[PDB]
Ligand binder design. Sequence first.
Ligand SMILES: [Mg+2]
Length: 560
Amino acid sequence: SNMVKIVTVKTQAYQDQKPGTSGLRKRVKVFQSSANYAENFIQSIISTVEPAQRQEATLVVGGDGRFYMKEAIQLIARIAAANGIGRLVIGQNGILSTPAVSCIIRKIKAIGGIILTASHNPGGPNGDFGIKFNISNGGPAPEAITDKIFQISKTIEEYAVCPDLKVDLGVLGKQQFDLENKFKPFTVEIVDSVEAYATMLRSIFDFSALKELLSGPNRLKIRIDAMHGVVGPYVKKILCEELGAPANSAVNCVPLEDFGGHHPDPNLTYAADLVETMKSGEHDFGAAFDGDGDRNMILGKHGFFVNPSDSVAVIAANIFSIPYFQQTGVRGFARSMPTSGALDRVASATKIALYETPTGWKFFGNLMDASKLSLCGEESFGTGSDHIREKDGLWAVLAWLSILATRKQSVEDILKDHWQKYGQNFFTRYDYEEVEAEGANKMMKDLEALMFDRSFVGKQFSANDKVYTVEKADNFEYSDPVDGSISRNQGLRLIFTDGSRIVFRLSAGATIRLYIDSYEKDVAKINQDPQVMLAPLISIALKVSQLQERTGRTAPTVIT
Ligand SMILES: [Mg+2]
């Protein structure tokens, strides 16, 4: 029945419901076996909305398809209705990519959205579940708001719910619910998962040029792997149906509740199927997306790997292949500090501002909201623009296709031309996972003390046929030019006079991340194996940090 009662449910607070920057993520089993775990958190989110503003408010709700998503969406609808939220907009079947949620929030001027995703983390009966809150600019809720949610969640003693309310998520259109002894109805609009996002992309990119690129006998041959995650229907409906790529272009493009039993995390080993496909030489372009669609990996013919640090640089160097940027102009470029310096060479050569930010969304969002940031990238497979306030993997793929269309060259030839023009930033990230915290912290503190010494700048480091001179060494700090905040201890940087860098970052077991960025201006040495070219700087990095001595690790856990 669509005439439902409002009921107050006594509850007991949990103490660990901390939203963080990417949402509250817990094992699916925790949500299911902890009474009112989800309910308490949803209520805590909604309690940050001023009662007076709820009736005219809309929340956008959707997720990445993982197990438990639809049950959580029903819970959100039952609690939102009871709390006097006037409207929910929900993707069909509950499905909305994270970029789609950001798109819709900003399009319909909603107060925010609740995204049911744990991004690249596994899903399924034994996987993870995440609940992410975005606010009215379409982006992640900032710390002041997540702090409030957490504080409310720790002392909550009841929540309001319409236990008999049920939303049909499969069916497009408005469902109205009349609440007992409430004048105004509760309205749920089920929208097509893809339409609003596709329409945005239709305005950003030249779909006529892309159709021509992707169809016919001379078509660019592409393989696009959604990794059984949320981007699946977007690939099928935009790249295949609208832009005319053959249906086999869409790989793993049916969303699955367990992401096919694998991690929806795009890199050369988690997406090893796509890589093996590309190695056959039949296809010109490959890409893979993460579970909720804000990360992307870019491959060329024969499986040529475009480092995410290079990808944002190539997009920057060819940015006016994209109609959006022809119209807005380029307001600025940004990358996270550990990302390679390739983007900087394009910004310097084209005289556009380069913002080097700590890891995290808020720094990019601030700059975008100041009209100072058009294109951003992160070495962790992140690429985006100010078209929305989340990173956007499928957008990054259509950027590449637009560039491929105007350049009329292979992905590899585009990179070779790029390196010949700007030099090459050989780049890798070493992850040392689950190291003992005491050793890793001692490693960081000792290295920081050593770098702080007056004589460390100007020191020279040699290995084989390579001499590196320290130009600067510090613990990265960022004063945000919008909110005034000062972020400290964002990473140990060893900056060398030749344009190369070593960066150390720390992030239930500590993880050391070691980023190596070797700038090579010699045309003869471009397109080499990065691991070979980076070996001198890796040796210098392990020796000055004494990482093996402090952690007992002789090798990183993961190399990217
Ligand atoms: Mg993600």
